[PDB]
Design an enzyme around this catalytic site. Structure first.
Site, PDB file in Angstrom:
ATOM      1  N   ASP A 109     -41.291   6.013  42.618  1.00 16.51           N
ATOM      2  CA  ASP A 109     -40.289   6.173  43.665  1.00 16.51           C
ATOM      3  C   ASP A 109     -40.665   7.110  44.807  1.00 16.51           C
ATOM      4  O   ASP A 109     -40.244   6.891  45.934  1.00 16.51           O
ATOM      5  CB  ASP A 109     -38.971   6.656  43.059  1.00 16.51           C
ATOM      6  CG  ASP A 109     -38.309   5.613  42.176  1.00 16.51           C
ATOM      7  OD1 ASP A 109     -38.899   4.526  41.975  1.00 16.51           O
ATOM      8  OD2 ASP A 109     -37.193   5.883  41.679  1.00 16.51           O
TER       9      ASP A 109
HETATM   10  N1  LIG Z   1     -36.469  15.767  41.040  1.00 18.97           N
HETATM   11  C1  LIG Z   1     -35.123  15.847  40.937  1.00 18.97           C
HETATM   12  O1  LIG Z   1     -34.452  16.851  41.151  1.00 18.97           O
HETATM   13  C2  LIG Z   1     -34.484  14.581  40.518  1.00 18.97           C
HETATM   14  C3  LIG Z   1     -35.049  13.337  40.933  1.00 18.97           C
HETATM   15  N2  LIG Z   1     -34.443  12.114  40.539  1.00 18.97           N
HETATM   16  C4  LIG Z   1     -35.010  10.765  40.965  1.00 18.97           C
HETATM   17  O2  LIG Z   1     -36.140  10.623  40.026  1.00 18.97           O
HETATM   18  C5  LIG Z   1     -37.114   9.876  40.811  1.00 18.97           C
HETATM   19  C6  LIG Z   1     -38.467  10.503  40.982  1.00 18.97           C
HETATM   20  O3  LIG Z   1     -39.630   9.735  41.071  1.00 18.97           O
HETATM   21  P1  LIG Z   1     -41.057   9.866  40.516  1.00 18.97           P
HETATM   22  O4  LIG Z   1     -41.322  11.261  40.100  1.00 18.97           O
HETATM   23  O5  LIG Z   1     -42.142   9.116  41.180  1.00 18.97           O
HETATM   24  O6  LIG Z   1     -40.462   9.198  39.071  1.00 18.97           O
HETATM   25  P2  LIG Z   1     -39.988   7.678  38.835  1.00 18.97           P
HETATM   26  O7  LIG Z   1     -38.599   7.811  38.367  1.00 18.97           O
HETATM   27  O8  LIG Z   1     -40.298   6.776  39.965  1.00 18.97           O
HETATM   28  O9  LIG Z   1     -40.940   7.228  37.615  1.00 18.97           O
HETATM   29  C7  LIG Z   1     -42.061   7.261  37.578  1.00 18.97           C
HETATM   30  C8  LIG Z   1     -42.789   6.233  36.868  1.00 18.97           C
HETATM   31  O10 LIG Z   1     -43.318   6.940  35.669  1.00 18.97           O
HETATM   32  C9  LIG Z   1     -43.672   5.802  34.730  1.00 18.97           C
HETATM   33  N3  LIG Z   1     -43.783   6.412  33.261  1.00 18.97           N
HETATM   34  C10 LIG Z   1     -42.697   6.682  32.408  1.00 18.97           C
HETATM   35  N4  LIG Z   1     -43.110   7.176  31.252  1.00 18.97           N
HETATM   36  C11 LIG Z   1     -44.471   7.259  31.277  1.00 18.97           C
HETATM   37  C12 LIG Z   1     -45.554   7.668  30.429  1.00 18.97           C
HETATM   38  N5  LIG Z   1     -45.288   8.140  29.199  1.00 18.97           N
HETATM   39  N6  LIG Z   1     -46.856   7.578  30.872  1.00 18.97           N
HETATM   40  C13 LIG Z   1     -47.168   7.100  32.127  1.00 18.97           C
HETATM   41  N7  LIG Z   1     -46.243   6.678  33.025  1.00 18.97           N
HETATM   42  C14 LIG Z   1     -44.946   6.754  32.624  1.00 18.97           C
HETATM   43  C15 LIG Z   1     -42.616   4.796  34.926  1.00 18.97           C
HETATM   44  O11 LIG Z   1     -43.085   3.584  34.524  1.00 18.97           O
HETATM   45  P3  LIG Z   1     -43.734   2.785  33.298  1.00 18.97           P
HETATM   46  O12 LIG Z   1     -42.664   2.412  32.343  1.00 18.97           O
HETATM   47  O13 LIG Z   1     -44.370   1.644  33.964  1.00 18.97           O
HETATM   48  O14 LIG Z   1     -44.721   3.645  32.706  1.00 18.97           O
HETATM   49  C16 LIG Z   1     -42.064   5.100  36.240  1.00 18.97           C
HETATM   50  O15 LIG Z   1     -42.091   3.933  37.125  1.00 18.97           O
HETATM   51  C17 LIG Z   1     -36.557   9.385  42.176  1.00 18.97           C
HETATM   52  O16 LIG Z   1     -35.889   8.083  42.226  1.00 18.97           O
HETATM   53  C18 LIG Z   1     -35.585  10.584  42.397  1.00 18.97           C
HETATM   54  O17 LIG Z   1     -34.592  10.459  43.349  1.00 18.97           O
HETATM   55  C19 LIG Z   1     -33.255  12.215  39.715  1.00 18.97           C
HETATM   56  C20 LIG Z   1     -32.699  13.409  39.306  1.00 18.97           C
HETATM   57  C21 LIG Z   1     -33.194  14.605  39.845  1.00 18.97           C
END
Ligand SMILES: NC(=O)C1=CN([C@@H]2O[C@H](COP(=O)(O)OP(=O)(O)OC[C@H]3O[C@@H](n4cnc5c(N)ncnc54)[C@H](OP(=O)(O)O)[C@@H]3O)[C@@H](O)[C@H]2O)C=CC1
Length: 180
Positions: A109
């Site tokens: 994201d």
């Molecule tokens: N920072 C804050 O204060 C907060 C942020 N948010 C929201 O969270 C998001 C942040 O994005 P970003 O940090 O890029 O995170 P994302 O939510 O986009 O996720 C990241 C990606 O990590 C992958 N992933 C999950 N588990 C594992 C694993 N064990 N190993 C490898 N990959 C993994 C996922 O896919 P896959 O299953 O393919 O592995 C996923 O697409 C945004 O939408 C934001 O608005 C929400 C609450 C608070």
């Protein structure tokens, strides 16, 4: 070994090792996924192998990467990642163009523009990280699944984008091994 599947390129641990071990400047982009797998220590080790090979490494932190403000910063500090190598979006988003590789570990994201259109999201109306502006873009994640935004990322299909499917920690560990 690498190969094409669907509309994306699926590389391997060695591909990533070859690509990065041979680049001159890499910018690491940590996200939620890195926190889930607690891959920070492995990641810093990788950065250490690259730095030793003369490669230039730095980290790009998005305001809401992860699940809490400054989430990636404390995780990187935890792994002893040098403080001066970590940069916030506003002071490094323009450096992607001058970078051979953009290592996106566990982030999604924070690179997708289609993710900041929802007004009920913590990322709404925030600048995204310009990973495409770099030579090559590596995406380390378990699959082609979306992130917290639930929307699809169009960078997974770009030409300079290679997917490295696997666990953030496990895959980074394999890449390190493949690098020696
Ligand atoms: N920072 C804050 O204060 C907060 C942020 N948010 C929201 O969270 C998001 C942040 O994005 P970003 O940090 O890029 O995170 P994302 O939510 O986009 O996720 C990241 C990606 O990590 C992958 N992933 C999950 N588990 C594992 C694993 N064990 N190993 C490898 N990959 C993994 C996922 O896919 P896959 O299953 O393919 O592995 C996923 O697409 C945004 O939408 C934001 O608005 C929400 C609450 C608070």
């Amino acid at each position: 070994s690498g190969h094409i599947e669907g509309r994306h390129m699926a590389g391997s641990a060695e591909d990533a090792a070859f690509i990065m071990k041979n680049a001159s400047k890499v910018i690491i982009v940590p996200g939620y996924g890195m926190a889930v797998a607690q891959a920070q220590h492995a990641l810093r080790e990788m950065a250490d192998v690259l730095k030793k090979e003369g490669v230039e490494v730095s980290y790009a932190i998005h305001p809401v990467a992860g699940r809490m403000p400054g989430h990636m910063n404390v995780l990187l500090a935890e792994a002893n990642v040098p403080y001066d190598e970590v940069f916030e979006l506003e002071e490094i988003n323009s450096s992607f163009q001058t970078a051979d590789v953009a290592f996106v570990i566990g982030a999604n994201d924070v690179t997708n523009p289609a993710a900041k259109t929802d007004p009920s999201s913590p990322i709404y109306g925030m600048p995204i990280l310009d990973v495409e502006k770099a030579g090559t873009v590596l995406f380390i994640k378990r699959s082609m699944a979306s992130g917290y935004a639930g929307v699809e990322n169009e960078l997974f299909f770009r030409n300079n984008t290679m997917m490295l499917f696997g666990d953030a920690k496990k895959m980074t560990e394999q890449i390190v091994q493949a690098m020696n």
